[PDB]
Amino acid sequence: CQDVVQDVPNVDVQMLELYDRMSFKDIDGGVWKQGWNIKYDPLKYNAHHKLKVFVVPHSHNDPGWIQTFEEYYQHDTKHILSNALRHLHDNPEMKFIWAEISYFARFYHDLGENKKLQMKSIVKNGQLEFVTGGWVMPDEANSHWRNVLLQLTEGQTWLKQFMNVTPTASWAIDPFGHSPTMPYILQKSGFKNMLIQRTHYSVKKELAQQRQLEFLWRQIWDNKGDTALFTHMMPFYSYDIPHTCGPDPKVCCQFDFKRMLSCPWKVPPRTISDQNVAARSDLLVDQWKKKAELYRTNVLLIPLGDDFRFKQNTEWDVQRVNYERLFEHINSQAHFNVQAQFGTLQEYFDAVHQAERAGQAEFPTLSGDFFTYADRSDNYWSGYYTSRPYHKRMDRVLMHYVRAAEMLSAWHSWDGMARIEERLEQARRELSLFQHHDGITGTAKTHVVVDYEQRMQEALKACQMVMQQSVYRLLTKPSIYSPDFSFSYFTLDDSRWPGSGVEDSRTTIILGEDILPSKHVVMHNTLPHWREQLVDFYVSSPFVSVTDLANNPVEAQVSPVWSWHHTIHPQGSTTKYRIIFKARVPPMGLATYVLTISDSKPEHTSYASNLLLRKNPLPLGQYPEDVKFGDPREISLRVGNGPTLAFSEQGLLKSIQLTQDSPHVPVHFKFLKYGVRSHGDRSGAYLFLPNGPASPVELGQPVVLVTKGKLESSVSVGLPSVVHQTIMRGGAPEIRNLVDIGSLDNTEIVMRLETHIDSGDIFYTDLNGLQFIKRRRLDKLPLQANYYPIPSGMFIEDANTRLTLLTGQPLGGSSLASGELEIMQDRRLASDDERGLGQGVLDNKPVLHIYRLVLEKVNNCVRPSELHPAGYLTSAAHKASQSLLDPLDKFIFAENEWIGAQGQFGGDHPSAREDLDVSVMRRLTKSSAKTQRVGYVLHRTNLMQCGTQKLDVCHLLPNVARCERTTLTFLQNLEHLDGMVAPEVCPMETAAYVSSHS
Ligand SMILES: OC[C@@H]1[C@@H](O)[C@H](O)[C@@H](O)c2nc(CCCc3ccccc3)cn21
Ligand SMILES: [Zn+2]
Numbered sequence: 001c002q003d004v005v006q007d008v009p010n011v012d013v014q015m016l017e018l019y020d021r022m023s024f025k026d027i028d029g030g031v032w033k034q035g036w037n038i039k040y041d042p043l044k045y046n047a048h049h050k051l052k053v054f055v056v057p058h059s060h061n062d063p064g065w066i067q068t069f070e071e072y073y074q075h076d077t078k079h080i081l082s083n084a085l086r087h088l089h090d091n092p093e094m095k096f097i098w099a100e101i102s103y104f105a106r107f108y109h110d111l112g113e114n115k116k117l118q119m120k121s122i123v124k125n126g127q128l129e130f131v132t133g134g135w136v137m138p139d140e141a142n143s144h145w146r147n148v149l150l151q152l153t154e155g156q157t158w159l160k161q162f163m164n165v166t167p168t169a170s171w172a173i174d175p176f177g178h179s180p181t182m183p184y185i186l187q188k189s190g191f192k193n194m195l196i197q198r199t200h201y202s203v204k205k206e207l208a209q210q211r212q213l214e215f216l217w218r219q220i221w222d223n224k225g226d227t228a229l230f231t232h233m234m235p236f237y238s239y240d241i242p243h244t245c246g247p248d249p250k251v252c253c254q255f256d257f258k259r260m261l262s263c264p265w266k267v268p269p270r271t272i273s274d275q276n277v278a279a280r281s282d283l284l285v286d287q288w289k290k291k292a293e294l295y296r297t298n299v300l301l302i303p304l305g306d307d308f309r310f311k312q313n314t315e316w317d318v319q320r321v322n323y324e325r326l327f328e329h330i331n332s333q334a335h336f337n338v339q340a341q342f343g344t345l346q347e348y349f350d351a352v353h354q355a356e357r358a359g360q361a362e363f364p365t366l367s368g369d370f371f372t373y374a375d376r377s378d379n380y381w382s383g384y385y386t387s388r389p390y391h392k393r394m395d396r397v398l399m400h401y402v403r404a405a406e407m408l409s410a411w412h413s414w415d416g417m418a419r420i421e422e423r424l425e426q427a428r429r430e431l432s433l434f435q436h437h438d439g440i441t442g443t444a445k446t447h448v449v450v451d452y453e454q455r456m457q458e459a460l461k462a463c464q465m466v467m468q469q470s471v472y473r474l475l476t477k478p479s480i481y482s483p484d485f486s487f488s489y490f491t492l493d494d495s496r497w498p499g500s501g502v503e504d505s506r507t508t509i510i511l512g513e514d515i516l517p518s519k520h521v522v523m524h525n526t527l528p529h530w531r532e533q534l535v536d537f538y539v540s541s542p543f544v545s546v547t548d549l550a551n552n553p554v555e556a557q558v559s560p561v562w563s564w565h566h567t568i569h570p571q572g573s574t575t576k577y578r579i580i581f582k583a584r585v586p587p588m589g590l591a592t593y594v595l596t597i598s599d600s601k602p603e604h605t606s607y608a609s610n611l612l613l614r615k616n617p618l619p620l621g622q623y624p625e626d627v628k629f630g631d632p633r634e635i636s637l638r639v640g641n642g643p644t645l646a647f648s649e650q651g652l653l654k655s656i657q658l659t660q661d662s663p664h665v666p667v668h669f670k671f672l673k674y675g676v677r678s679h680g681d682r683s684g685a686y687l688f689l690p691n692g693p694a695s696p697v698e699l700g701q702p703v704v705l706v707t708k709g710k711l712e713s714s715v716s717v718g719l720p721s722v723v724h725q726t727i728m729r730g731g732a733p734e735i736r737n738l739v740d741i742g743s744l745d746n747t748e749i750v751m752r753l754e755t756h757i758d759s760g761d762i763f764y765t766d767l768n769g770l771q772f773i774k775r776r777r778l779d780k781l782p783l784q785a786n787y788y789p790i791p792s793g794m795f796i797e798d799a800n801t802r803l804t805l806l807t808g809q810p811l812g813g814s815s816l817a818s819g820e821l822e823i824m825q826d827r828r829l830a831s832d833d834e835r836g837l838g839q840g841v842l843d844n845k846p847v848l849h850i851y852r853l854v855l856e857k858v859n860n861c862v863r864p865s866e867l868h869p870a871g872y873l874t875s876a877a878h879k880a881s882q883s884l885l886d887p888l889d890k891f892i893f894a895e896n897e898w899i900g901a902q903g904q905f906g907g908d909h910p911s912a913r914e915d916l917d918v919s920v921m922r923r924l925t926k927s928s929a930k931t932q933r934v935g936y937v938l939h940r941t942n943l944m945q946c947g948t949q950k951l952d953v954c955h956l957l958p959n960v961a962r963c964e965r966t967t968l969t970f971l972q973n974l975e976h977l978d979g980m981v982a983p984e985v986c987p988m989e990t991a992a993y994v995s996s997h998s
């Protein structure tokens with residue numbers, strides 16, 4: 001294993017380092033507005049050194065944006081694919097690339113066998129080439145690496161299964177900035193090459209000047225370079241035809257033959273004839289040779305396409321016939337020294353690697369990311385890190401439910417009548433669809449966001465049905481287990497989605513001596529280690545005690561059920577209560593507990609006090625402790641031996657103390673607002689264009705609720721637009737915000753932490769929940785350029801102290817000053833930001849955001865070199881993130897009686913090292929397969945050293961006949977394991993295994 005802390009990689013281009021050196025001057029470069037007038041020596045080219053030009057036809061198909069997936073399919077995409085099948089069949093030299101497998105699968109399944117075989121023939125002869133082959137072309141900012149892998153696996157499994165092809169070249173022309181998470185997954189998925197487009201205009205110029213637009217993209221911690229993937233960055237403003245032939249879009253637009261739609265430079269395309277072909281070819285080859293000066297080989301990529309292009313058969317004809325006339329002329333005239341032809345992406349990369357093998361070029365190394373993206377001036381695309389934050393949170397919930405459902409159902413082979421495979425396939429595809437760069441980003445029209453939401457709701461329900469069937473099977477004696485595959489044996493209880501304040505939907509367990517004295521509940525732990533977590537349930541009485549199925553008492557706490565109403569005041573339930581207790585659940589396992597009613601106060605159940613700080617002072621039915629009242633004031637709570645927390649008069653954190661003999665370190669939560677410019681460019685779904693720094697929110701004298709208990713305590717307050725809550729369970733606290741931005745038009749609400757940590761200009765954000773990247777705040781860039789994706793975490797630190805904020809949802813954030821962290825909560829925007837959506841963001845809905853807040857001492861931790869581009873979490877911050885993203889699942893038994901009930905599953909499962917995760921467990925075979933196969937993805941993170949059994953997934957199921965190390969998609973074997981034992985994986989490595997069983 002490489003060390004990833006002490007060694008700093010030696011790369012030609014390190015993007016944080018380059019960012020420090022770059023001026024970011026926004027100079028008019030001429031016809032290439034954001035570059036310079038390209039010059040080439042024409043005697044560069046001769047019969048022995050010709051330019052080789054691949055013209056690569058394509059059609060950018062958004063799986064939802066202005067229209068829904070199905071709308072686009074019926075209106076556009078089905079015609080594009082019908083015409084591709086017809087035109088490529090009929091024209092053997094014509095080529096086409098396709099990226100979105102969601103659309104291709106939707107099309108292919110609707111064809112007759114003859115059309116299906118026609119399609120196979122134009123894929124096998126290489127006319128139609130799949131690029132990437134994901135379900136979508138995913139967002140790279142907000143997306144979790146697990147969901148990027150899921151949608152890649154879903155697309156590539158479809159291609160392998162139905163087309164017998166696995167792409168090794170990736171095409172990502174539209175995501176709004178690019179993440180090194182992509183090459184990481186792609187290079188561990190058998191890829192050899194990738195292509196990106198949307199990078200800062202200043203970055204394109206800088207790399208172009210050094211011919212560093214092709215580079216070996218390695219991870220920021222990779223010393224050796226084994227993660228390196230060859231990457232082609234396109235040089236110009238767009239993927240459209242005016243911005244892909246060469247530097248002058250007025251010229252390139254004349255070779256978009258569909259525009260004879262028109263050219264905004266006001267020179268239309270001309271039909272190619274014997275009369276003008278010499279002149280037209282001279283214009284075009286001049287553009288090609290200028291573009292070729294920016295790259296190191298004599299092999300040139302010329303994409304030919306745009307949004308939903310190649311829809312009409314007359315577009316196919318007008319593009320094909322005019323380019324054939326150009327190629328015929330150019331190829332036959334020696335003076336050009338060009339060979340031009342329709343090609344695919346793989347053909348381009350194959351030719352580039354031939355030129356490299358033959359010493360014609362060596363490529364530079366690069367580490368870093370391409371956030372935050374700007375397409376022009378100060379138009380930074382940090383808005384979509386936050387846009388439609390309800391659906392951004394829903395992504396993380398469904399992420400976990402798909403993992404839980406695949407893992408719980410993987411333990412057994414299921415009869416086809418259970419429809420397990422059908423529900424999981426639906427769940428994977430709706431979650432995969434939402435990874436789209438107009439899904440999770442929140443950049444689609446109102447009705448399309450509604451479609452994504454309804455699809456993810458159906459996916460959640462499918463997961464619940466699979467999970468409850470699986471739990472019933474795993475915990476019922478096989479001698480009794482006699483399933484009805486349509487029955488609800490359990491209902492799921494989730495206290496964090498949607499959240500009781502968003503939707504009052506949690507079921508109450510109704511107990512009573514006559515009606516039903518006791519209720520079985522079951523916790524699932526998807527993580528491969530022993531876990532204790534407080535869990536809660538709604539119960540109809542406060543007189544409830546908890547036992548395991550062995551009748552061992554379990555210490556519990558009962559709290560009232562509070563909700564908040566309209567200024568903003570709490571109300572207690574007189575009819576339902578929260579029972580809280582510590583579930584202990586095996587690795588990848590289940591634990592059964594029992595809730596029982598009694599006459600009076602149980603022996604092992606404590607009751608919380610309830611202080612309502614307010615100026616002019618509530619029943620709680622049977623709740624044994626009366627609500628106490630007071631005037632606003634400073635309060636201080638400790639739970640267990642964990643941190644002591646001081647809160648302001650207004651119910652917001654002001655200080656944390658770690659241990660009894662620790663200093664009270666200050667940490668001030670504060671809600672500010674950003675506004676929208678009245679003059680010049682407007683913030684919208686994409687762009688963050690603040691009219692200056694944020695100004696404090698008008699807090700007033702808000703009602704403050706303090707709940708104090710042995711196991712769990714809480715401070716809630718009803719601030720305008722936010723119900724803010726700090727929850728203490730005896731480690732790092734949990735923050736919940738119920739955010740209702742209401743009708744505050746042209747507002748972005750931000751949550752800031754003000755510390756005295758001596759961070760300076762340094763801060764750390766994660767990429768795709770996989771790695772933490774060093775950020776430097778740059779005063780030479782505007783505020784919106786210092787905003788980065790916060791997909792799972794952010795942190796600041798000096799020599800002694802670190803504060804880490806973990807998120808249950810991707811949001812935008814920064815450290816705009818020494819010892820600050822800030823993260824945006826919601827944004828309501830009356831204006832369009834001129835990126836084609838043609839609406840503002842006025843469809844806000846109440847969302848419950850969740851966080852863990854981890855103040856630590858790091859002076860005794862091995863931190864990486866001051867030069868290292870990476871950061872690493874501590875064990876505590878990492879476990880806190882795991883608590884947010886993969887909590888214990890809760891199941892309530894539906895019926896009165898459970899004959900066969902067992903207490904535990906997975907008691908014998910290995911409790912793997914804290915830094916290892918079974919990211920994926922998925923059974924790969926149906927019941928009708930002679931040999932059962934199960935795929936595992938294992939991820940080992942890297943935790944900071946500050947001062948467990950071996951997990952072999954090959955042997956997790958019995959009767960292992962074979963084990964393979966595979967690509968992350970499970971689609972190819974990389975290493976036969978003779979000992980059928982999985983070698984363990986290095987820090988910051990992700991590996992996949994497929995185990996066979998006889
Ligand atoms: O800008 C980003 C979005 C992105 O969200 C989509 O996923 C991507 O496919 C896309 N295509 C366009 C075309 C430009 C709009 C237009 C077209 C003619 C006239 C006026 C405006 C915009 N976008
Ligand atoms: Zn797009």
Ligand SMILES: [Zn+2]
Nearest residue numbers: 964973976977
């Ligand atoms: Zn083998």
